[PDB]
């Protein structure tokens, strides 16, 4: 089971300036519950985006993808191809835009949070992958976050 997990604005934006341009604490709790115990795979920019206090993410096998042969990630395995990163019964690809694009052909599930903010796509933004017809989705109810934002969860699958 290779899965992808991300949160996006309706427009598809997931990242900007090395950060996520919103906060949604219920989504972090959801992210932790889905990924905990498993292997997590991330691009080097996403690893750099985690504050040192939170990296590696606890209780998970952290794997970082870089083309730098000598890249060091204290607390994580570093691999040179996505295919080398995928492990064991369950791996979650946790970002960012480049690594989601690379991992989608190997993915069976996507767990997606849609954040209802009118955040327009800007040049240089990291974007979520677009899911074609092979994906089947189940739509959750809209909810309101402690942060003030409206959001809903999608669970996508394919066989």
Which residues participate in the annotated binding site for NADP(+)? 19, 44-46, 66-68, 96-99
CB 12 within 8 A of CB 137: no
Residue 67: count other Cβ atoms within 10 Å of its Cβ.
Answer: 8
Q: Does 32 bind ligand RK4 (CB under 6 A)?
A: yes
What does 54 bind: ligand RK4, ligand NAP, none (CB cut-off 5 to 8 Å by kind)? ligand RK4
Number of residues engaging ligand RK4 in binding (CB under 6 A): 7
State how far the Cα of 88 lies from the Cα of 128, in Å rounded to an integer: 25
Q: Which is nearer to ligand RK4, 54 or 130 (CB)?
A: 54
Helix, strand, coil share (%) of the chain residues, nearest 5: 20, 35, 45
**Contact positions toward ligand NAP, by CB under 6 A?**
6-7, 14-16, 18-20, 43-46, 49, 65-68, 71, 80-81, 94-99, 102, 126
């Amino acid at each position: 089971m290779v899965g992808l997990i991300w949160a996006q604005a309706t427009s598809g934006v997931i990242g900007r300036g090395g950060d996520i341009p919103w906060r949604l604490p219920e989504d972090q709790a959801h992210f932790r519950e889905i990924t905990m115990g498993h292997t997590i795979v991330m691009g080097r920019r996403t690893w750099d985006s985690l504050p040192a206090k939170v990296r590696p993410l606890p209780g998970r096998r952290n794997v970082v993808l870089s083309r730098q042969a000598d890249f060091m990630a204290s607390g994580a395995e570093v691999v040179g191809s996505l295919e080398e990163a995928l492990t064991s019964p369950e791996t979650w690809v946790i970002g960012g835009g480049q690594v989601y694009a690379l991992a989608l052909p190997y993915a069976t599930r996507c767990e997606v949070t849609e954040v209802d903010i009118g955040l327009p796509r800007e040049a240089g933004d990291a974007l979520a992958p677009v899911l074609d017809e092979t994906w089947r989705g189940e739509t959750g109810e809209w909810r309101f976050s402690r942060s003030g934002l409206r959001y809903r969860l999608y669970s996508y699958h394919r066989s």
